[PDB]
Amino acid sequence: NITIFTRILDGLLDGYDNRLRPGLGERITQVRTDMYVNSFGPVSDTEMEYTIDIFFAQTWKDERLRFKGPMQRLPLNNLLASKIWTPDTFFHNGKKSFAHWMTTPNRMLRIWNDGRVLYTLRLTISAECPMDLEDFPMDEQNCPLKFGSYAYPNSEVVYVWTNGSTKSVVVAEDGSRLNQYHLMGQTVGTENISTSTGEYTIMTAHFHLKRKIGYFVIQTYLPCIMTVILSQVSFWLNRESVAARTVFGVTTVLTMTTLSISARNSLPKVAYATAMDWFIAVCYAFVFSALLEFAFVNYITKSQPARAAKIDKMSRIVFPILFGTFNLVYWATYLN
Amino acid sequence: NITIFTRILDGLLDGYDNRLRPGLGERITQVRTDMYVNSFGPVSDTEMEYTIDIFFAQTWKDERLRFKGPMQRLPLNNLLASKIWTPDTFFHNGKKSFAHWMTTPNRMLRIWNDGRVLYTLRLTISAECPMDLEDFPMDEQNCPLKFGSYAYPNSEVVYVWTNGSTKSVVVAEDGSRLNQYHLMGQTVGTENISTSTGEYTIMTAHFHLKRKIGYFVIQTYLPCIMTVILSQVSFWLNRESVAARTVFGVTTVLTMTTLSISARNSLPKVAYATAMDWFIAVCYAFVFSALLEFAFVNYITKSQPARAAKIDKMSRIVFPILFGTFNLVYWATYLN
Amino acid sequence: NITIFTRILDGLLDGYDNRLRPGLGERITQVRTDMYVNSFGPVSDTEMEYTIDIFFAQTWKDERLRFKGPMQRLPLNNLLASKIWTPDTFFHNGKKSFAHWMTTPNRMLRIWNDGRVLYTLRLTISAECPMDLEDFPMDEQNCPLKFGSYAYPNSEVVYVWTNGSTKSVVVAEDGSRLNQYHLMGQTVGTENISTSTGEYTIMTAHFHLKRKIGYFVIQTYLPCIMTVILSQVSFWLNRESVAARTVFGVTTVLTMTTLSISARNSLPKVAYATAMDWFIAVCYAFVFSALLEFAFVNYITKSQPARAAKIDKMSRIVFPILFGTFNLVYWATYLN
Amino acid sequence: NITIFTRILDGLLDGYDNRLRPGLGERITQVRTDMYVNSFGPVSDTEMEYTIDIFFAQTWKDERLRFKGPMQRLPLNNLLASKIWTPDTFFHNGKKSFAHWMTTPNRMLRIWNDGRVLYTLRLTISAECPMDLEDFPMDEQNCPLKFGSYAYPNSEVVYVWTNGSTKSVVVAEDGSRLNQYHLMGQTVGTENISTSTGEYTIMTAHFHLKRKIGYFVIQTYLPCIMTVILSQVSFWLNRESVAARTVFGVTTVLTMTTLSISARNSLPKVAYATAMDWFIAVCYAFVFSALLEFAFVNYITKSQPARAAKIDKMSRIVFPILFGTFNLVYWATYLN
Amino acid sequence: NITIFTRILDGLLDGYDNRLRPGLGERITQVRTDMYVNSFGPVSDTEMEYTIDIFFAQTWKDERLRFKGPMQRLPLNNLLASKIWTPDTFFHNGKKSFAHWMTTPNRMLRIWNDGRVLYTLRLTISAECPMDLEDFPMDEQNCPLKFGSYAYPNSEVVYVWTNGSTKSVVVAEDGSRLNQYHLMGQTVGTENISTSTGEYTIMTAHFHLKRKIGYFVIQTYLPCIMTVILSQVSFWLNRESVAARTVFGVTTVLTMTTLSISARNSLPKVAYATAMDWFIAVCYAFVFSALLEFAFVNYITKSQPARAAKIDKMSRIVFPILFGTFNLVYWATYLN
Numbered sequence A, B, C, D, E: 001n002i003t004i005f006t007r008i009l010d011g012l013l014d015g016y017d018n019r020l021r022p023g024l025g026e027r028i029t030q031v032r033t034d035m036y037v038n039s040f041g042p043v044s045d046t047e048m049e050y051t052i053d054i055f056f057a058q059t060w061k062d063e064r065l066r067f068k069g070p071m072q073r074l075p076l077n078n079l080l081a082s083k084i085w086t087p088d089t090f091f092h093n094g095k096k097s098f099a100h101w102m103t104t105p106n107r108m109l110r111i112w113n114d115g116r117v118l119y120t121l122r123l124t125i126s127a128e129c130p131m132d133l134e135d136f137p138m139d140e141q142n143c144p145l146k147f148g149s150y151a152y153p154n155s156e157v158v159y160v161w162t163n164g165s166t167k168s169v170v171v172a173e174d175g176s177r178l179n180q181y182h183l184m185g186q187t188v189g190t191e192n193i194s195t196s197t198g199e200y201t202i203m204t205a206h207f208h209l210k211r212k213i214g215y216f217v218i219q220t221y222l223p224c225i226m227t228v229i230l231s232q233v234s235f236w237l238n239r240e241s242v243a244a245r246t247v248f249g250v251t252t253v254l255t256m257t258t259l260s261i262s263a264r265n266s267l268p269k270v271a272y273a274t275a276m277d278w279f280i281a282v283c284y285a286f287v288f289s290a291l292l293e294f295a296f297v298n299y300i301t302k303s304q305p306a307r308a309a310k311i312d313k314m315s316r317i318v319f320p321i322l323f324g325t326f327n328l329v330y331w332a333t334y335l336n
C-alpha cells in the first residue's frame, strides 16, 4: 500500500528538468512568500547589523508535478528538494546567511494534486541595518530585510506577499525581545529595480525599532548628573580653602572627561555628535565653569572681597537652577 | 559466515524509499526520545544563550526493516543512516547547532528483528535562554530546550519521552559544573503548537539554574561595602581639616561611580535596575551623604559650632547603624 | 513545448569538455569583467583589511555553446555552471573570500545563440589595504582590489574591463557608507606580471578613501585641548597655594599620559609617530611646562619675589597664545 | 610491473562490506592505539578547555585484507580509508574537534599480508579540563583525554594501549611549551562505562600540569607588596600633617581595591576564594589598618598626645614585621 | 581541432590508479618544491603564531602521464587534480591551514610530454612560532615553516628545493610588511626525522624577524621616563610643603604601577622578566626612592635641618645623573 507513493514520486521526476523554471516561455512564474520570525537576533550597533532567525516559506505552481492518488498532499523533506526546481531567492542586504543542518537539514517540501508546491526553509540572516544616531539614545531605527531572485528577472519570476501584511510576516511573542530595543511593528513592501542584467522585483520587510532607555541613564546620564552636583558642593566651602575647592573642580573635570571616553567605547565610532554627547558637553561646561568661578573668586578675594562673596553666594542658586532647567529642555525635546 | 550480514543489509535496502516515513497512510509514526547531557556548556548571560553537548537518541518502528538471522541486533554506524528514513528533528530555540565529525561521524544505528530502530546522535546546541535579571544575582533561571519535527505534523509524527522523566533526560555528574550557576534539576514536558503548516508536537526540557553567589561579593559588594566604611572615617577627623575630609568624600564618590560602570560591563545591557544596582545606589547615597554632612558642618562651623560637633559626633553612630541595618534587610529579602 | 529547452541543454553538454578553455590552441580567450559593489564593508585599520560585497560578472565567448531555438537567451542558475568551463579568477590580495549559498548558491548563467556566456557571482572579499598613517587622522587611503587568472597565463586568458570605467565598477548609493571614511571614488587599471609560471594580466580596482574627522576630535583632541586649558588655570592662583597648583600640574600631566595610551589602543601598533601623536606630545609639553613654571616660581618666591610675579603674570598671556597659535599651524598644515 | 598493485587493491575491495566490523559474530575486534602529541595547545582557564594537536594512530586485524605480493606492505593515503571499515573512535570530553585537510587530508593507511591495518590521523582537540582553583596560582591540574567507540560496545570493539605507557603516549620536546604551565608528565588508563546502549571501554590519558609562577608575581603580588610598603611610609610622617597621611591611606586602599578587580579579570569567574585572593585581602587589611591607625592617632592627638606618639612609633616596627611574617607563612604553606 | 586534447586526457586517465605513487617499487619519487609568499600575515605574539599566504608549488615526474601532441604543455585547473596522484604534503607546525576556493579552487596543474607535473596551490597557514622574549622588545625571532609527506617515508618520497635558496623561497616586496617586525631574510634547510612509522624528510624554511621599536617607546618607555622626571620635581619644592611633595611621590608610584600592568596586557603572559620589565622596575625604584628621600628628609627636618637641606640639594643632581646614566647602559646593552 506504500509502494504507490514511490511510483508517484518516480513518475514525477521522470522526464523532469530542474534547470528550467515552471511555465518557461509560456507565462511568468509567480511566487508567494510568507515569513515567520522565530527570534529577532541581537542588533549590533557597532557593526550596523542585526541577526534574525526565520522560517522562510515559498509557494508556487508547477504543472509538471501534477499527480493522482489517494492523498491530496505529499509531505516530504529536503531529500526531494534538490531534485526539483526552486527559486534562487537571496537576500540583497544579507552580509552573511547560513542554514541549519541538525539533526536533519531544516527544510520542508509539500506537493498538491494541482501542482502547487510549498518550500519552507529555516535561515539565520546577519543583515545590515544602517542607522542615523543623531537622536541617540532617543532614536528610532527601521531595519530592512530585502530579498529576491538572483538570476530570474521580473519578466520570468515575480514575488508577491500572501494574504494581508499581518499574515505575510509574523514575529513570535518571545522572539521580539531585545536588551536595548523595542520591536514596535513590521511593514512589508515591494519595488522593481533596474540592473545591467534586467529588471528584478524586490520584496522588502521593515522592522520598526524603538530604543529602550534606562541602561544609558544608569551608565552615562546619572554619573554625569551626580558629578555636576558634586562640583556645586565646592560653592558651599570657604574661599580660603583653596586646596579643598581645587580637588572638587579638578576631579570632576577629569571624571567627566573619562565618562565621555567610556560612553563612546560601546557606541559606534560615528563622526558626528549625538544627543548624549551634547548632554555630556553641557555637563562638562558646568563642572569646568564652577572651577573657573573658584579661580576668578580666588583671584579677587583680596582686592574686592565683597564681590567674591556675592558671586559665591549667587552661584549656589544659579548653577542648580540652570542645570535643572537644561534637563527639562533636553528631556522634553528628545522625548516629545 | 560474515556474508550473511551483507545479504540482510542489501535485502532491506532493496525496494526501500527513504523519502517516505514508516506506516505512511496507515498509522501515525511514534518516536521515543532519550537525552544524555555529556556536559552543560557555559551560559552566556550577555548573549542569553547556553551551550550544551548531548547524545540525542531516537527510537521508532519501521516494518520495512524486519529481518531474520542468527543475531537479533545489527550494530552499525553513520554509513547506513543516510540510506533509511530518519525523523527531521530540529531545535526550535537552537540558534546554532553543529555536529561532531571526528574521528568518524558520531552516530549510531541499531536494528532489531521486529523493525525497531535506534538512532543516536551527538550534538552541541547553542540555544537561547531568555532571563529576567530583576533579582540578579539572587536570580533563578529556567533555560529550556525545545525540539520537534520540521516537516511532519502531529498527524504523522509524534514525539514522546521514553520511560519516566528521570530516564528521559540524564546529566553527567561532572557535566553539570558551571562557574556561576548550580544545576538544581531538570524537567520534561510536551505541548502542541498550531502553525500555518499544521499542528506539531513539541518536546520541551527545562534546566533549573540557581546562580551561585560569591564572585560578585568579591568583585562588587565588598569593594562597595569597604568604600562606604572608608567614607565614614572622615567623621572621626577634625572639622578644620577641610582638605583631608574632602579627599575622603570625593575619592569615595568617584570610586563608587566607577564600580557601577565596571559592574555592568560584564552584566547584560538590560534596561532596568537589578538588585545589585540598588545596593550600589544605596552605597552611593551613604558616601555622597557623608560628603554633604561635611559640607553642611563646614558651612556652620563658625556661626553655631555647637551643633556642628553634635552632628559630626552623632553621624559616627548613625551612619554605621543604617548601613548595617540596610544589609540585613537587603540580604534577607533576596536570600529568603 | 518546454521539452525543447531540455534537448538544447543536453545537446550542448554532449561532447563537451569543461577541462578545456574555449578557443584552445586557436586563439586567446578574452574575458570582460564588470563589478557592482553592493556594500563597501568595514575597514579594519588594525588588521589593514577591508571587507566588500560585490556581484562579480564575467563575460566570454564559447563557440561550443551555440544553439538555435525560439529564445535568443537561456537564463539559468548554478546547476549548469559546474558543467561548463569557467575562468579560474581569483583575488591576489584577498586574504579570505567566501561565497553566499542561501537560499540557493547566488550564481547566474546566461547563454546566447552566438555562444556568448554571462557568469555572475556574489562574493564577500576580505582584502588587504596597506596604509601609511603618517598624516593620520588627516590621511587618504587607496585600497586596491586585484584579481586575475590563477592557471591561464596572458597568452591564453586576458581580462579587460567592459565599456568605460564608470560602467566597469559601480558602487551602490547606500553601500558607500562608513563610520570613519568617505568613498571619494573608484579607479580601474591593468598590468601584466611576470612569474615563474608565465605572464599574467592583472585587473586592478582602487577605492579612494578620505577619512572623516570628528570622532577623534570628540575622543582625543578635545580632551587634550581642555586638559591644557585646565593646567593654565594654575597660573591664576597665588604662589603660596603650593598644594593647589601642584594638583593641577600633576593631574593634568597624568591625564595627558593616559590619553596617549588610550588613543593608540584603537590605532594600529605602527612603529612611527602620527600627526595626532605630535599634537598630544605638544599638549603634553604645555601641561608639563606649566608645572615647571610653578616649580621654578616656587623655588625663587623668596629670594626674588619680583620676578616670580612677573613670570606668573606673563605666563597667563604667553601660554594661551602659543597653544592657540600652534592649533592654527597644526590644523592648517594637515587640512591644506 | 605497477599494475600488480592495482589488481591487489581491486581484489581486496571486491566483495568487501565496510559497514561490518572484522570478525563480526566470530570474535571481538581489538584495537591498539598510540598517540603522539605534536604540540600541547594553549590552556584556556576561563573556558576550562585545552587545545592539543596529535597524530592519532589505530591498529587492528582484518582477515578480509589478506594479500600476497612482492611487497609485504602497502603504503597508501586517505583515498582508500573510506573504502574499508574503520573504528568510530570519538572523544567524550572533546568539545570541538576538527581535522587538517591541507594540502591533502592528513591520513595514512598501511596494510600487511596478514591483514594488519594501520590508520593514522591528525587531529586538533579542544577538550575540557575542569580545574579546582583553590590553591591558585600554586595549583596542579590533571587535564584528561578520553576517547572510545561510539557505536561498538565492549562486547565487539576493545581499545588497548600498545607496548608500555611511554610508547603509548609521546609528547614532542618543543610541543610541551606553555606560557603558564609545566607539563610534568603523562599517564594512561582504562575503564569500562555502563550506558543505556551497553558497556563501552574508555581509554583515558591524563596530562599533569604544574602552573609556573612569575607572571602573577610581576602582575599581582609585587604591586600589592609595594602598595603595602607605601602605606607604611605614612607612619614616618608627623601627625599634624593630616592631609599628607590621608593621601597615603586613601590612595593605597583604592589601589588595592582596583588590583583585586584587575587580578580576577583574567581569572575565571569562580565562586570561591583563591590563595591569591587571601593574599590580596590580607594586604588590603594592612593598608586599611594603617589608615585606621592614623584616624585613631589623629582623634587622640589632643587629649593624650603621649600615647599617640607611642602608637605611631610602635606601628613603624609592628606593621613591617607582621607583613613580612605573613609572607613566609603564605609562601611556605603553598610552596610546600 | 580541440577534440584531440580531450582524447589525450581520456587516454592518460585510462588504466590510471591515483592511489599509487609514480615509480612505485621501481625507484624513489622525487618532489621539487618552490614557494612564493604573497603576504607575510600578522604575527600573534600572544598566541605564538604567524599567518602566511603562499603559492605552494610542487614538481615531480610521472611516466604514466606521457603523451604526444601538437602542444608540449597542457595547462589545466583543479578539475584534473583529484584524478591523478599528488603528494600528501602537510605542515607539521601548521596549527590551522585553509585553502582558497573563490571564485574557483585556486589550483593549477600542468603536464609536459616527458611526464613532468606541476601542481601549484594557494594556502593560508597559521603556523606556530615559539619565541624567547628575554630581550623583548630588542628581540630577534626565527619563525619556521616545516612541511613534508604524511604517509610516504623517505624511502618512497623525497622533497628537495629547486634551484638555489633565493629561487626556492620568494617574498613579495609589499607582502613583507608588518607593524612590529622587520623581515630581514629567509633561509631553507632539510632534515630527516625518525618516527614509529618510518623515516621522513622534512623541508624547513625560517623567516628572520627583527622587531621594530618605536611603538613601545611611545607607549611604555616615554611615559615611564617622563614619570620619573615628574617625581624629581619634588626635590625643588620646600620641605615644609609636606602635602605638595606627597602628591608627587604617591601619584608617580601608582602611575608606574599601572604602566607595568598596562604594558603586559598586550605582551604574552610569560613567566619571566623581559628587558622592558627591568626598565620599568628601575624607573619604579627612582620614583619610590624619591618618596623615601622626602620621608627621610621630613623625619629629620627638625633635629638636624642642616643635613636635610644638603640631601635635598644633592638629590637634585644625583637622581637625574643616575637615571640618565642608566639609560645609556640600558639602550647600549640591548642595541649592541
Ligand SMILES: Cc1onc(-c2ccc(F)cc2)c1COc1ccc(C(=O)N2CCS(=O)(=O)CC2)cn1
Pocket: A092, A093, A146, A148, A149, A150, A151, A193, A194, A195, A196, A197, A200, C034, C035, C036, C038, C055, C056, C057, C120, C172, C174
Ligand atoms: C553586475 C551584476 O550582475 N548581476 C547583478 C544582479 C542584479 C540583480 C540581482 F537581483 C542579482 C544580481 C549585478 C548587480 O546589479 C545590480 C543589482 C542591484 C542593484 C540595486 O538596485 N541595488 C543594490 C542592492 S540593494 O541595496 O538591496 C538595492 C539597490 C543594482 N545593480
Ligand SMILES: Cc1onc(-c2ccc(F)cc2)c1COc1ccc(C(=O)N2CCS(=O)(=O)CC2)cn1
Pocket: A034, A035, A036, A038, A055, A056, A057, A120, A172, A174, B092, B093, B146, B148, B149, B150, B151, B193, B194, B195, B196, B197, B200
Ligand atoms: C512559515 C512557517 O513555515 N513552516 C513553519 C514551521 C512550523 C512548524 C515547524 F515545526 C516547522 C516549521 C513556519 C512557522 O510556523 C510556526 C512555527 C512555530 C510556531 C510557534 O508556535 N512557536 C515558534 C517557535 S518556539 O518559540 O519554539 C514555540 C512557539 C509558530 N508558527
Ligand SMILES: Cc1onc(-c2ccc(F)cc2)c1COc1ccc(C(=O)N2CCS(=O)(=O)CC2)cn1
Pocket: C092, C093, C146, C148, C149, C150, C151, C193, C194, C195, C196, C197, C200, E034, E035, E036, E038, E055, E056, E057, E120, E172, E174
Ligand atoms: C610559485 C607560483 O606558482 N604559481 C604562481 C602563480 C603566478 C601567477 C598567478 F596568477 C597565480 C599563481 C606562483 C607565484 O608567482 C607569482 C605570482 C605573483 C607575483 C606578483 O607579481 N605579485 C604577487 C601578487 S600581488 O601582490 O597581487 C602583485 C605582485 C609574482 N610571482
Ligand SMILES: Cc1onc(-c2ccc(F)cc2)c1COc1ccc(C(=O)N2CCS(=O)(=O)CC2)cn1
Pocket: B034, B035, B036, B038, B055, B056, B057, B120, B172, B174, D092, D093, D146, D148, D149, D150, D151, D193, D194, D195, D196, D197, D200
Ligand atoms: C543516550 C545515549 O545513547 N548512546 C549513548 C552512548 C553511550 C556510550 C558511547 F560511547 C556513545 C554513546 C548515550 C549516552 O550514554 C552514556 C554515555 C557515557 C556515559 C558515561 O559514563 N560518561 C559520560 C561521558 S564521560 O564524561 O567522558 C564519562 C562518563 C553515560 N551514558
Ligand SMILES: Cc1onc(-c2ccc(F)cc2)c1COc1ccc(C(=O)N2CCS(=O)(=O)CC2)cn1
Pocket: D034, D035, D036, D038, D055, D056, D057, D120, D172, D174, E092, E093, E146, E148, E149, E150, E151, E193, E194, E195, E196, E197, E200
Ligand atoms: C604516531 C604517529 O603516526 N604517524 C606519525 C607520523 C610520522 C611522520 C609523519 F610525517 C606523519 C605522521 C606519528 C608521529 O610520529 C612522529 C612524527 C614527527 C616526529 C618529529 O620528529 N617531530 C614532531 C613534528 S615537528 O615538531 O615538526 C618535528 C619533530 C616524531 N614522531
Ligand SMILES: *[C@@H]1O[C@H](CO)[C@@H](O)[C@H](O)[C@H]1NC(C)=O
Pocket: A154, A190, A191, A192, A201
Ligand atoms: C513592477 O513591474 C510590474 C510589471 O507588471 C508592475 O505591475 C508593478 O507595478 C511594478 N512595481 C512598481 C513598484 O513599479
Ligand SMILES: *[C@@H]1O[C@H](CO)[C@@H](O)[C@H](O)[C@H]1NC(C)=O
Pocket: B154, B190, B191, B192, B201
Ligand atoms: C496534542 O494532540 C494529541 C492528539 O492525539 C493529544 O492526544 C494531546 O493531548 C495533545 N497535547 C496537548 C498538550 O494538548
Ligand SMILES: *[C@@H]1O[C@H](CO)[C@@H](O)[C@H](O)[C@H]1NC(C)=O
Pocket: C154, C190, C191, C192, C201
Ligand atoms: C600586456 O601584454 C599585452 C600583450 O598583448 C599588451 O598588449 C599589453 O599592452 C600589456 N600590458 C601592459 C600594461 O604592458
Ligand SMILES: *[C@@H]1O[C@H](CO)[C@@H](O)[C@H](O)[C@H]1NC(C)=O
Pocket: D154, D190, D191, D192, D201
Ligand atoms: C572491562 O571489561 C573487560 C571484559 O573482558 C575486563 O576484562 C576488564 O577488566 C574490564 N575493565 C575494568 C576496568 O573493569
Ligand SMILES: *[C@@H]1O[C@H](CO)[C@@H](O)[C@H](O)[C@H]1NC(C)=O
Pocket: E154, E190, E191, E192, E201
Ligand atoms: C636523509 O637521508 C638521505 C638518504 O639518502 C641522505 O642522503 C641525507 O643526507 C639525509 N639527510 C640528513 C640531514 O641526514
